[PDB]
CSV table of C-alpha atoms and ligand atoms in Angstrom, one decimal:
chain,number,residue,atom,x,y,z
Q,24,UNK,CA,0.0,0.0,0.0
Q,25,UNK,CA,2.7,2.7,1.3
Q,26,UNK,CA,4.5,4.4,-1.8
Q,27,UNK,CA,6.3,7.8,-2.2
Q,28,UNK,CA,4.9,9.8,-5.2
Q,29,UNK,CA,7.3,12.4,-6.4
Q,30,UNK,CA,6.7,15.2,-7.9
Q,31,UNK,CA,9.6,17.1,-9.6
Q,32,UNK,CA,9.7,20.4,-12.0
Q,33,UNK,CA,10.3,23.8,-12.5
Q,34,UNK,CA,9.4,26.6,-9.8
Q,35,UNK,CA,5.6,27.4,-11.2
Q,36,UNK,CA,5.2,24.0,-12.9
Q,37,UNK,CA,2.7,23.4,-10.9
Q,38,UNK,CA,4.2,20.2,-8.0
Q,39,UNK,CA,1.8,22.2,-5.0
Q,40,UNK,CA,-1.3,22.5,-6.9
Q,41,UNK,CA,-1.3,19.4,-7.9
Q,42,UNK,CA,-0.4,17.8,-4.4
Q,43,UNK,CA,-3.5,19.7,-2.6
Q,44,UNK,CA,-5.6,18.5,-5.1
Q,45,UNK,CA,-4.7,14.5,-5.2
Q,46,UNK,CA,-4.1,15.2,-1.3
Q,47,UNK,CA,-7.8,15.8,-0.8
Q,48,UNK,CA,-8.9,13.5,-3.5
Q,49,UNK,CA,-6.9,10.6,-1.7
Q,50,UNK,CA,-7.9,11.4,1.6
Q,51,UNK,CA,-11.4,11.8,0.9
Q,52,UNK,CA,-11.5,8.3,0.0
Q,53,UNK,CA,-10.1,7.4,3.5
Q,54,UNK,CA,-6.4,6.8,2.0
Q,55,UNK,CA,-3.5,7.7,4.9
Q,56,UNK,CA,-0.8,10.1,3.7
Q,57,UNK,CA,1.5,12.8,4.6
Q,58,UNK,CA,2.7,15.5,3.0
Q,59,UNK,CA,6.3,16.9,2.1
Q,60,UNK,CA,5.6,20.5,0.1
Q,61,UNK,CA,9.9,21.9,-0.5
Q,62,UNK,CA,8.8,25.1,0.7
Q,63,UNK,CA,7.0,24.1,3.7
Q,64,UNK,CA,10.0,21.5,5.5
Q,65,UNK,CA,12.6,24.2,4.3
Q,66,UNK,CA,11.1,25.8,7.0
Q,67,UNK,CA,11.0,22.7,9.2
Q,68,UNK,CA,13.3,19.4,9.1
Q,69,UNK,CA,15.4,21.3,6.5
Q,70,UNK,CA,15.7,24.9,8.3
Q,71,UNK,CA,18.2,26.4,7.4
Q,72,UNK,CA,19.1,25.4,4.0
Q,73,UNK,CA,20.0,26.8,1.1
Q,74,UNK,CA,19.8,26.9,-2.9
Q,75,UNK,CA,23.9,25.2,-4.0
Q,76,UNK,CA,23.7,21.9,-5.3
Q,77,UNK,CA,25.4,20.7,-1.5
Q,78,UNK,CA,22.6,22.2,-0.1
Q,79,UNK,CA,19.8,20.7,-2.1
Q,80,UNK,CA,21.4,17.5,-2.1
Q,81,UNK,CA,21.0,17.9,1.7
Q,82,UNK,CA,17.5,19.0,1.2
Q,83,UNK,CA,16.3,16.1,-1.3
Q,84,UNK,CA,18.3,13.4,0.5
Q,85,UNK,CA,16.3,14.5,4.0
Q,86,UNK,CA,13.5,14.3,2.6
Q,87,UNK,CA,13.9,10.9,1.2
Q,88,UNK,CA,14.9,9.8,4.3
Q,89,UNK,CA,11.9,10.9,6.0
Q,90,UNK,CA,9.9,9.4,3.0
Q,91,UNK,CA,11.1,6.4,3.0
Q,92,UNK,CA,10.5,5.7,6.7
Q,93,UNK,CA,6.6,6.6,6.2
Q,94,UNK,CA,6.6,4.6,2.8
Q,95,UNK,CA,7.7,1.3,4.6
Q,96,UNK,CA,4.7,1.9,7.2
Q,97,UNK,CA,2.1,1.8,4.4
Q,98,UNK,CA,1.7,5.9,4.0
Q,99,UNK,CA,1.5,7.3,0.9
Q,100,UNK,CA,3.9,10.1,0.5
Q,101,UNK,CA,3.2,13.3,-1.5
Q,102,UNK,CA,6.8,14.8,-1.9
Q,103,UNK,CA,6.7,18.3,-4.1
Q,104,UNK,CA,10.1,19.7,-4.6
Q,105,UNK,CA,12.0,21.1,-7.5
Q,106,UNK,CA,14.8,18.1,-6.9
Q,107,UNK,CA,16.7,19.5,-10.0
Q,108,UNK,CA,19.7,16.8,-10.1
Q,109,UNK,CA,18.7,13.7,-11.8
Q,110,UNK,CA,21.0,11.4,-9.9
Q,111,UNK,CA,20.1,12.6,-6.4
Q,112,UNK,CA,16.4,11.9,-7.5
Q,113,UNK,CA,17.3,7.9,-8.8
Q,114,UNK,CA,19.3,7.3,-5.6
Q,115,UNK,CA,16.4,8.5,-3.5
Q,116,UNK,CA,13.7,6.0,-5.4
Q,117,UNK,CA,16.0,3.4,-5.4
Q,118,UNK,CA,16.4,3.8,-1.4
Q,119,UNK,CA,12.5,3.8,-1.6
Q,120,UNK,CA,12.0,1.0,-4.1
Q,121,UNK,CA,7.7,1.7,-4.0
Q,122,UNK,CA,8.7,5.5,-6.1
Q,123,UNK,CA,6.6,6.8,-8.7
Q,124,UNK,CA,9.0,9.7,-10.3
Q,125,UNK,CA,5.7,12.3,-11.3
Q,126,UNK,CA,7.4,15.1,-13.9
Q,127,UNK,CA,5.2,18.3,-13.7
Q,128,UNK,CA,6.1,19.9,-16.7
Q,129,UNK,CA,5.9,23.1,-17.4
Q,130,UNK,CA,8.2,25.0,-20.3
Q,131,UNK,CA,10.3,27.5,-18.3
Q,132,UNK,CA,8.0,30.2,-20.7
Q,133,UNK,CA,5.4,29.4,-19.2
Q,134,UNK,CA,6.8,29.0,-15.8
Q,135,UNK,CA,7.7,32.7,-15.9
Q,136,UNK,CA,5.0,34.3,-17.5
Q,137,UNK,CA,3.2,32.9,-14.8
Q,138,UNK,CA,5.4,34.5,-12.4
Q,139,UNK,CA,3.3,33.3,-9.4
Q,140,UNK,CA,5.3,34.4,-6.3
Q,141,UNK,CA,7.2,37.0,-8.6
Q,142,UNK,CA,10.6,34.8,-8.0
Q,143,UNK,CA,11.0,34.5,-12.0
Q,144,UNK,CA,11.4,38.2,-12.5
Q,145,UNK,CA,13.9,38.7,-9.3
Q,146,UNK,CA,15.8,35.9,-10.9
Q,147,UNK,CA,16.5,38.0,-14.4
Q,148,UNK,CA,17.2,41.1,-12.4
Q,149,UNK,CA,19.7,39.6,-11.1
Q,150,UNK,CA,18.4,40.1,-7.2
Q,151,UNK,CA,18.1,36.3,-6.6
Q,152,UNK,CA,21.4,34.0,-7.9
Q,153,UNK,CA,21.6,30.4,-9.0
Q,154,UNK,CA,17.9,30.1,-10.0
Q,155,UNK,CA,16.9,27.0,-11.1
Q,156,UNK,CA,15.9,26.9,-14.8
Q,157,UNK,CA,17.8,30.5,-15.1
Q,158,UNK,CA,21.4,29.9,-13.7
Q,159,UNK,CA,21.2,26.7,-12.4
Q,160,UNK,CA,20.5,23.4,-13.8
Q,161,UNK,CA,17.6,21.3,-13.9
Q,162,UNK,CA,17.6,17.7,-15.2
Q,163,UNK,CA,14.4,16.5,-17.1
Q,164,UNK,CA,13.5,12.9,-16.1
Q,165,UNK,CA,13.8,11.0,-18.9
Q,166,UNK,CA,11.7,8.1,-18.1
Q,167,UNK,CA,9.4,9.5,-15.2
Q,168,UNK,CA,6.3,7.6,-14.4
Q,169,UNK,CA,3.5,9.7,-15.1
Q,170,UNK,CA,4.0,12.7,-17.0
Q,171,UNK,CA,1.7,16.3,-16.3
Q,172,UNK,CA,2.0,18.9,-19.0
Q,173,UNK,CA,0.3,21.9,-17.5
Q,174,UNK,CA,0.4,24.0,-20.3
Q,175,UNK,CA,-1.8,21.1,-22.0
Q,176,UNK,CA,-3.8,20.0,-18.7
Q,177,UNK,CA,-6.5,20.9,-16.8
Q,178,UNK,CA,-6.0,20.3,-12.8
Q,179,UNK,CA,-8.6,17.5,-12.4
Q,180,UNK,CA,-6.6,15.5,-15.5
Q,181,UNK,CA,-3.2,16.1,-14.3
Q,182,UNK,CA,-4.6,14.8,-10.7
Q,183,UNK,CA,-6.4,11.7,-12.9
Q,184,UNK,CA,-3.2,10.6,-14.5
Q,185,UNK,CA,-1.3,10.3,-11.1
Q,186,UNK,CA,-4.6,8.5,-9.7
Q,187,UNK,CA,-4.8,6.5,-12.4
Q,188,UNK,CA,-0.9,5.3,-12.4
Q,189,UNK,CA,-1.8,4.3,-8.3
Q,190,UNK,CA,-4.4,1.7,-9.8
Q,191,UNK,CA,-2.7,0.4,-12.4
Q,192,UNK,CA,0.1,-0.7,-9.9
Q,193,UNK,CA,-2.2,-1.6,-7.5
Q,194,UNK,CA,-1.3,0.8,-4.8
Q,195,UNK,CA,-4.9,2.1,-4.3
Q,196,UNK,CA,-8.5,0.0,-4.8
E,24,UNK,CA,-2.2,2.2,18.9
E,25,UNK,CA,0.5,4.4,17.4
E,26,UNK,CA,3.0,6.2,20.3
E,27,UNK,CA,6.0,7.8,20.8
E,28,UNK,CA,7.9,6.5,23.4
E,29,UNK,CA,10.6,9.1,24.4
E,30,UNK,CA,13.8,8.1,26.7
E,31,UNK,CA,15.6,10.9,28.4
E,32,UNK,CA,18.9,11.0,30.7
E,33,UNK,CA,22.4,11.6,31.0
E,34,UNK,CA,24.9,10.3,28.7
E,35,UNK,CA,25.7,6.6,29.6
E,36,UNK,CA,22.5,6.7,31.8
E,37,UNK,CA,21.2,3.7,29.5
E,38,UNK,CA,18.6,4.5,26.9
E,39,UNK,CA,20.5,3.0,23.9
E,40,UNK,CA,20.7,-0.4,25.8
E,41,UNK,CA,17.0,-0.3,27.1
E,42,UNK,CA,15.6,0.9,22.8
E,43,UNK,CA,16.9,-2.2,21.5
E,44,UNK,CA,15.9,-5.1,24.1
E,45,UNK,CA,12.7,-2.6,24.2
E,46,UNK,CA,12.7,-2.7,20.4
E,47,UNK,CA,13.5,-6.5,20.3
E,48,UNK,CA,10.8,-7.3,22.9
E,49,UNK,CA,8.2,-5.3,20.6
E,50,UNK,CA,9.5,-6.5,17.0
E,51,UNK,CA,9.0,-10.3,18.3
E,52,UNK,CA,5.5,-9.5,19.2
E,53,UNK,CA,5.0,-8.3,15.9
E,54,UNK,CA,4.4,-4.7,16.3
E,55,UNK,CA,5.6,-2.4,13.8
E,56,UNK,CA,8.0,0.3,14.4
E,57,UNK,CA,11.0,2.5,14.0
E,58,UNK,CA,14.0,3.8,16.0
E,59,UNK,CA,15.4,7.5,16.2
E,60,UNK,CA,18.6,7.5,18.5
E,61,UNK,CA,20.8,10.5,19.1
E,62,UNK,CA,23.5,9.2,17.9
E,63,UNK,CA,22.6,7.8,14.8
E,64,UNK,CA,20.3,10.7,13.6
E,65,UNK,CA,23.4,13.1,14.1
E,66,UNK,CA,24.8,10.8,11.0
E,67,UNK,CA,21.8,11.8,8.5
E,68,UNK,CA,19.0,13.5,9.3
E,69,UNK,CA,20.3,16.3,12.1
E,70,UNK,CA,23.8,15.8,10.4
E,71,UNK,CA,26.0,19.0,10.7
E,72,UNK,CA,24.6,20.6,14.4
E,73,UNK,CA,26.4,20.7,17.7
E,74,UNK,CA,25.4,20.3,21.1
E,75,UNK,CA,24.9,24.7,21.9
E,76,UNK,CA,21.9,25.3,23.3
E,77,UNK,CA,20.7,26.3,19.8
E,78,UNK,CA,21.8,22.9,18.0
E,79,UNK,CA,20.0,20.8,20.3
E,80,UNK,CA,16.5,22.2,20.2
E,81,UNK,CA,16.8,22.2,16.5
E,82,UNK,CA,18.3,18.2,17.0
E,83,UNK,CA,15.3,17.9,19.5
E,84,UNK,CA,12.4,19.1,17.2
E,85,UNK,CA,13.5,17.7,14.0
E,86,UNK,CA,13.8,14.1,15.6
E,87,UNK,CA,9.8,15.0,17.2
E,88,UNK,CA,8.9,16.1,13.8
E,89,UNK,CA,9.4,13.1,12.2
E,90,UNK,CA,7.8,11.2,15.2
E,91,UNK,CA,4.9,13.2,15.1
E,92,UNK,CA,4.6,11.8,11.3
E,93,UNK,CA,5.6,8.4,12.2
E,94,UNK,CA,2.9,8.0,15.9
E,95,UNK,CA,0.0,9.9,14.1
E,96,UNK,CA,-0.1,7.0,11.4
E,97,UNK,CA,-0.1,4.5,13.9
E,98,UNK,CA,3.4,3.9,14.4
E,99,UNK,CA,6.0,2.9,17.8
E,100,UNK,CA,8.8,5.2,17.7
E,101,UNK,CA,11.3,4.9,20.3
E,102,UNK,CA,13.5,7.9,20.6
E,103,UNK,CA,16.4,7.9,23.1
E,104,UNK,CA,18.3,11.0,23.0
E,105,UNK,CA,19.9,13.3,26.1
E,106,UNK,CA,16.9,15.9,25.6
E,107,UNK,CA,18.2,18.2,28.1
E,108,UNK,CA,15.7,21.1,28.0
E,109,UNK,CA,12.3,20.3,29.9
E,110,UNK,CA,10.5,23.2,28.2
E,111,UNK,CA,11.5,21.6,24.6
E,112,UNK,CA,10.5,17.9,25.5
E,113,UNK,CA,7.0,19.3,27.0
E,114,UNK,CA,6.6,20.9,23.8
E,115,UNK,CA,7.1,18.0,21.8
E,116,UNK,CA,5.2,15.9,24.4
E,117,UNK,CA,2.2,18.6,23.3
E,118,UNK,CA,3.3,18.2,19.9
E,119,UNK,CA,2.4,14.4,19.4
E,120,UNK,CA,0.1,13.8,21.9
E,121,UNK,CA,0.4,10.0,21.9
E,122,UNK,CA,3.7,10.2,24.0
E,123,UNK,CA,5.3,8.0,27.0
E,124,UNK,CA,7.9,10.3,28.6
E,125,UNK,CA,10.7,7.4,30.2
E,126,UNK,CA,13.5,8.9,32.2
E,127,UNK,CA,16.5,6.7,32.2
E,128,UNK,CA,17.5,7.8,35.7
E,129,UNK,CA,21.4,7.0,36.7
E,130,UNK,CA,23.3,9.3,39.1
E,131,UNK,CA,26.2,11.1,37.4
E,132,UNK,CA,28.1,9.4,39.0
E,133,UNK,CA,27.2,5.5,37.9
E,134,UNK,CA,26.9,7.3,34.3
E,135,UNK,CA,30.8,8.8,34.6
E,136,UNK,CA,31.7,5.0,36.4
E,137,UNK,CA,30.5,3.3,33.2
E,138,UNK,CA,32.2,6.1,30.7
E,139,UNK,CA,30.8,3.6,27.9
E,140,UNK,CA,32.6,5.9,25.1
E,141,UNK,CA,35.3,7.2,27.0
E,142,UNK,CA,33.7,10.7,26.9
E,143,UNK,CA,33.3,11.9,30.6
E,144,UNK,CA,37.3,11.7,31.0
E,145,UNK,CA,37.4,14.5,27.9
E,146,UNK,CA,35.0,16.3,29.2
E,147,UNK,CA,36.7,16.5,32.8
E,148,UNK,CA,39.8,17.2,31.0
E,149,UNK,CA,38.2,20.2,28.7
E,150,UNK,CA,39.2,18.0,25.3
E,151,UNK,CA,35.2,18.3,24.9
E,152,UNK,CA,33.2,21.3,26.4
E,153,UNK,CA,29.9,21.8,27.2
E,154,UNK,CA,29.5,18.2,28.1
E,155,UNK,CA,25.9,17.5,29.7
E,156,UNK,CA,26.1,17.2,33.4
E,157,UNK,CA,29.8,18.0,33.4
E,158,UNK,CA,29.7,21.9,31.6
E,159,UNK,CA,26.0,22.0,30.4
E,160,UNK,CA,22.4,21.9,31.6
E,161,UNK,CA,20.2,18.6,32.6
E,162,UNK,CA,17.0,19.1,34.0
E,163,UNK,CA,15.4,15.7,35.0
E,164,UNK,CA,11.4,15.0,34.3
E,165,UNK,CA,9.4,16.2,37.1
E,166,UNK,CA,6.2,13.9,36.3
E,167,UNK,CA,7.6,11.1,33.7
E,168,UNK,CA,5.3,8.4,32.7
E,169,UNK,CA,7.7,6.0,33.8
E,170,UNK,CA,11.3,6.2,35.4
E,171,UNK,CA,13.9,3.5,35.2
E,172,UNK,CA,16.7,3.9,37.8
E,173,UNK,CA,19.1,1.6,35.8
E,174,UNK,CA,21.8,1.8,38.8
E,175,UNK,CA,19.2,-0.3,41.0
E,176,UNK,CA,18.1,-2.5,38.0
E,177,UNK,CA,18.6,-5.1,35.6
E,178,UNK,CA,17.4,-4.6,31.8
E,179,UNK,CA,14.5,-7.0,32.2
E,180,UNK,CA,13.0,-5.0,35.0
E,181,UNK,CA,13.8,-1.3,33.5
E,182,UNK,CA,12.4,-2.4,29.9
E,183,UNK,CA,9.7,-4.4,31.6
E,184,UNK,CA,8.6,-1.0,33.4
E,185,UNK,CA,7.8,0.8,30.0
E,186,UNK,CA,6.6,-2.5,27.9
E,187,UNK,CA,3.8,-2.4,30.8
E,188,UNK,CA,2.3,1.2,31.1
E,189,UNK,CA,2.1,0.3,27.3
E,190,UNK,CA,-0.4,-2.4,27.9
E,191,UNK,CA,-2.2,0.1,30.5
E,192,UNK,CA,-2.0,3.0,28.7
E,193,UNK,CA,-3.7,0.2,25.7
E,194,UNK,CA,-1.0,0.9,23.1
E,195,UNK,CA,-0.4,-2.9,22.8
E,196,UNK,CA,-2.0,-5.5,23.8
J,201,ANP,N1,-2.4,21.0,-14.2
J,201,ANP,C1,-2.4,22.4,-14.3
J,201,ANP,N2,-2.9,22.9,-15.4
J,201,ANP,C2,-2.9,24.3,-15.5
J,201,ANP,N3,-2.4,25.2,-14.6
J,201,ANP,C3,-2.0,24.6,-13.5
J,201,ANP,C4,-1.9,23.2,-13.3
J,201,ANP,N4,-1.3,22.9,-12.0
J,201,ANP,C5,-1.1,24.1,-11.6
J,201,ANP,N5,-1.4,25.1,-12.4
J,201,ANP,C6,-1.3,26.6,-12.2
J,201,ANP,O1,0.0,27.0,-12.4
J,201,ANP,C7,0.6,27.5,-11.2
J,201,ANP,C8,1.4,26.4,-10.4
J,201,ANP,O2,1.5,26.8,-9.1
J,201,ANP,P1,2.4,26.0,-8.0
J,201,ANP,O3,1.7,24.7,-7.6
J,201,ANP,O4,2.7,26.9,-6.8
J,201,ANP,O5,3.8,25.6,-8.8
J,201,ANP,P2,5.0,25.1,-8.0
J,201,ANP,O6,5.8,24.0,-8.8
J,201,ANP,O7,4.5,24.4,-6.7
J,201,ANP,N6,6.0,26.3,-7.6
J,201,ANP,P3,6.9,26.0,-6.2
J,201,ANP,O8,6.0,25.1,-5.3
J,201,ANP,O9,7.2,27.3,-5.5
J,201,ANP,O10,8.3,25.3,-6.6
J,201,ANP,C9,-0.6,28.0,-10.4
J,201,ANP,O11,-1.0,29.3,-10.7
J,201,ANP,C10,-1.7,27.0,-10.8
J,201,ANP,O12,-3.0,27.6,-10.9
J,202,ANP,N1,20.0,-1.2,34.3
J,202,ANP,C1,21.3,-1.2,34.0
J,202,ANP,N2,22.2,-1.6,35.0
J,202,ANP,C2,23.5,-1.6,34.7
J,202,ANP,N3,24.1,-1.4,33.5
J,202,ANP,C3,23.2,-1.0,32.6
J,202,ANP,C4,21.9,-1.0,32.7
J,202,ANP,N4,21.3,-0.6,31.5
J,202,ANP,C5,22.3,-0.5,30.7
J,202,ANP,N5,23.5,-0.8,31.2
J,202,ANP,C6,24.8,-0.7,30.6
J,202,ANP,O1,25.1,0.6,30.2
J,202,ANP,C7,26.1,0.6,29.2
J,202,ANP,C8,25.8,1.6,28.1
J,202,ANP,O2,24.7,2.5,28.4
J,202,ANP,P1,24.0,3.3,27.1
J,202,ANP,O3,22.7,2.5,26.7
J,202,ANP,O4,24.8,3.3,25.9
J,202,ANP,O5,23.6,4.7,27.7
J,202,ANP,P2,23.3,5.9,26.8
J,202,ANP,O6,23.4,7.2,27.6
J,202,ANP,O7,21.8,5.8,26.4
J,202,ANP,N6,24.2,6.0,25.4
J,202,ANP,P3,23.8,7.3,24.4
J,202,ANP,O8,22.5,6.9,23.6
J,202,ANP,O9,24.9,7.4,23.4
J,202,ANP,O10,23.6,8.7,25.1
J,202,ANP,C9,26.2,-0.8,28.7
J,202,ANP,O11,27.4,-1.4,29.0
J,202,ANP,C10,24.9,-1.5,29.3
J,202,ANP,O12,25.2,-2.9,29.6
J,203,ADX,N1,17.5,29.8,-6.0
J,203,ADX,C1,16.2,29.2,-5.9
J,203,ADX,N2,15.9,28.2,-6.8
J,203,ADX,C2,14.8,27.6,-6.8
J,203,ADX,N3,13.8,27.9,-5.9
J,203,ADX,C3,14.1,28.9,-5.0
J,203,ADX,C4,15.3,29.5,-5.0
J,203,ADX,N4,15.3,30.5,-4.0
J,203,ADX,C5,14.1,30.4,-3.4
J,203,ADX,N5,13.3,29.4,-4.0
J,203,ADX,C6,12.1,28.9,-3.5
J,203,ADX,O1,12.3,27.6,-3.0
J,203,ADX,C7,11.4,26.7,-3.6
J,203,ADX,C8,12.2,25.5,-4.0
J,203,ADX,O2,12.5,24.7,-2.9
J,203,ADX,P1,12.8,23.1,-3.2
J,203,ADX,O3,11.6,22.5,-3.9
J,203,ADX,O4,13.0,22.5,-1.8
J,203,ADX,O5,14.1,23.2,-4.0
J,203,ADX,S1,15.1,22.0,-4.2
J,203,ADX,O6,15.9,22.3,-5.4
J,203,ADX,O7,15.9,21.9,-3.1
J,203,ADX,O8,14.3,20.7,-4.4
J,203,ADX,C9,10.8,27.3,-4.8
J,203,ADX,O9,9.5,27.1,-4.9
J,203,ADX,C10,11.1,28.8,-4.6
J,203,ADX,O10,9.9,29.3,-4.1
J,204,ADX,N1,28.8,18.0,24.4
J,204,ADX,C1,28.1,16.8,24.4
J,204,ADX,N2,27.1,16.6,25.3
J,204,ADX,C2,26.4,15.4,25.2
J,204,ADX,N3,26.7,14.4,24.4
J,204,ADX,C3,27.7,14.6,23.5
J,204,ADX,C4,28.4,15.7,23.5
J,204,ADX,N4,29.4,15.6,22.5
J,204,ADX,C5,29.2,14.4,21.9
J,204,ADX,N5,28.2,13.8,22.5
J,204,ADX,C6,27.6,12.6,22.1
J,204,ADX,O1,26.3,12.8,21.5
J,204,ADX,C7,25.3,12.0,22.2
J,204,ADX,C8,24.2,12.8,22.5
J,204,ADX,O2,23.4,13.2,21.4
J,204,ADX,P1,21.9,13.6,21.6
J,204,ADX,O3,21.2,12.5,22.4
J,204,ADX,O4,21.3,13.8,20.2
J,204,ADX,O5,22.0,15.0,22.4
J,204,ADX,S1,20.9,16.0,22.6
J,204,ADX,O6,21.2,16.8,23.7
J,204,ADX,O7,20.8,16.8,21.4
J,204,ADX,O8,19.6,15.3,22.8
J,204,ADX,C9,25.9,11.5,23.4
J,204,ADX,O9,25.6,10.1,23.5
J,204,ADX,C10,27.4,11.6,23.2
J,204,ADX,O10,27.9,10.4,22.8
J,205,CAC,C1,35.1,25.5,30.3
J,205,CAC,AS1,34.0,27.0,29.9
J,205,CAC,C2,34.3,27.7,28.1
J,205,CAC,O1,32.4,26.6,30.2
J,205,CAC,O2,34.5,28.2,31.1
J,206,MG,MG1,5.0,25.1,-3.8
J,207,MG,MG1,23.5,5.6,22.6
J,208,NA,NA1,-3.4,24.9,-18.0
């Protein structure tokens, strides 16, 4: 039953949205889970973290670990985080083993005309350094699980493609 | 019938030893669960803090955070760490709710006679400062749920202690 669903992308792509929405969906239905939104434990297990690639390593590799303790207790896990290195993200599943690799993707135009906490902009100014998708890398998954184009989707069918990945491996009735 | 059971005291005071013949004891009876000791936590998941005043409450909280995950999913979670501050394990006690405060109870004196690691010699000697009971603060439980004197006991009767308010307090059978 327990398996860690993460969901990796650009800043804007749309990871949170979509993790309130199948977080209601799945607990409406009497599923247990817990959440791990990047933003929110950055101000909690991972306090005092920052953006360089040692530091997110630290962030995404916490977070695994916390993940995968829940995931081996039968809890479904709903982990949104940029997780921009591809490698950090493959040692993390296979740590996990029950992993589904969700790639909420959003072109970086879209992510930025979008602009949704104003980040984007502060980015180009020059203000905020080592941005991801700006200067600093982020590695597409190549072979994620389920992907969510959310240029193309609507909310409900982005949320029904993760849902519908859960039955097809049986993690859900 | 998920708790946190949370073992406090001074270094070599015994909590180590009593989490794994408690976490044998429990694993043979088939309950599910999962083990946060000070030490190893310090290796991943509070790697990088000290023991300042600052360090530990972070060390503290982030080891009841993911406790509070764990016992509100139905988990056992044993936790034995120094947890010198009293206002910091009430908080976390308030925190989780489900939570068996065990105060492994040896004079300083047994606890610096055993020296398990070696570590009250360097802190007599100033190689380490700001050793707990030597150069920093321990304030014992004033109303634990159980207290194990481990200078006038044997494992069997210290673990014993806890492995029964359990089955009063109905967390196992
Ligand atoms: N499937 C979708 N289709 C269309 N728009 C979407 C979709 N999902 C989210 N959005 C919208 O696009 C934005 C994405 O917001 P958000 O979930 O905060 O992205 P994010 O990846 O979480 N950014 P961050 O959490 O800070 O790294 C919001 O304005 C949503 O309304
Ligand atoms: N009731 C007891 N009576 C006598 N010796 C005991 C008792 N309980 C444990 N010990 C001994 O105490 C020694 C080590 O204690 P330990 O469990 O490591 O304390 P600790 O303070 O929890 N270590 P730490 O987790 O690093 O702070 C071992 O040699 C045990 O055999
Ligand atoms: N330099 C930055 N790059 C990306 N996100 C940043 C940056 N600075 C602040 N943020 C904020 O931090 C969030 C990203 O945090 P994470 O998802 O936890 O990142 S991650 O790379 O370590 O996985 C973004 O949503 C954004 O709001
Ligand atoms: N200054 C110190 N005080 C106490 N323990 C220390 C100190 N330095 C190293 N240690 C080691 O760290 C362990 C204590 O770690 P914790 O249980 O995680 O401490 S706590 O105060 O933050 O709860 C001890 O068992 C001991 O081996
Ligand atoms: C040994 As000192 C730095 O507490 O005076
Ligand atoms: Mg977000
Ligand atoms: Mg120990
Ligand atoms: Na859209």
């Amino acid at each position: 039953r327990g398996v860690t669903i993460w969901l990796t992308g650009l800043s804007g792509a749309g990871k949170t949205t979509i993790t309130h929405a199948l977080e209601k969906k799945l607990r409406d239905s009497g599923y247990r889970l817990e959440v791990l939104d990047g933003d929110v434990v950055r101000t909690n297990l991972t306090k005092g973290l920052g953006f360089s690639k040692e530091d997110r390593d630290t962030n995404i590799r916490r977070i695994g670990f916390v993940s995968h303790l829940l995931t081996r207790n039968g809890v479904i896990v709903l982990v949104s985080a940029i997780s921009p290195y591809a490698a950090i993200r493959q040692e993390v599943k296979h740590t996990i083993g029950d992993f589904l690799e969700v790639f909420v993707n959003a072109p970086l135009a879209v992510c930025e005309e979008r602009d949704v906490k104003g980040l984007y902009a502060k980015a180009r100014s020059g203000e905020i350094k080592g941005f991801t998708g700006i200067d600093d890398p982020y590695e597409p998954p190549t072979n994620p699980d389920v992907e969510c184009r959310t240029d193309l989707e609507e909310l409900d069918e982005s949320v029904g493609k993760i849902w519908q990945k859960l039955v097809d491996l049986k993690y859900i009735e």
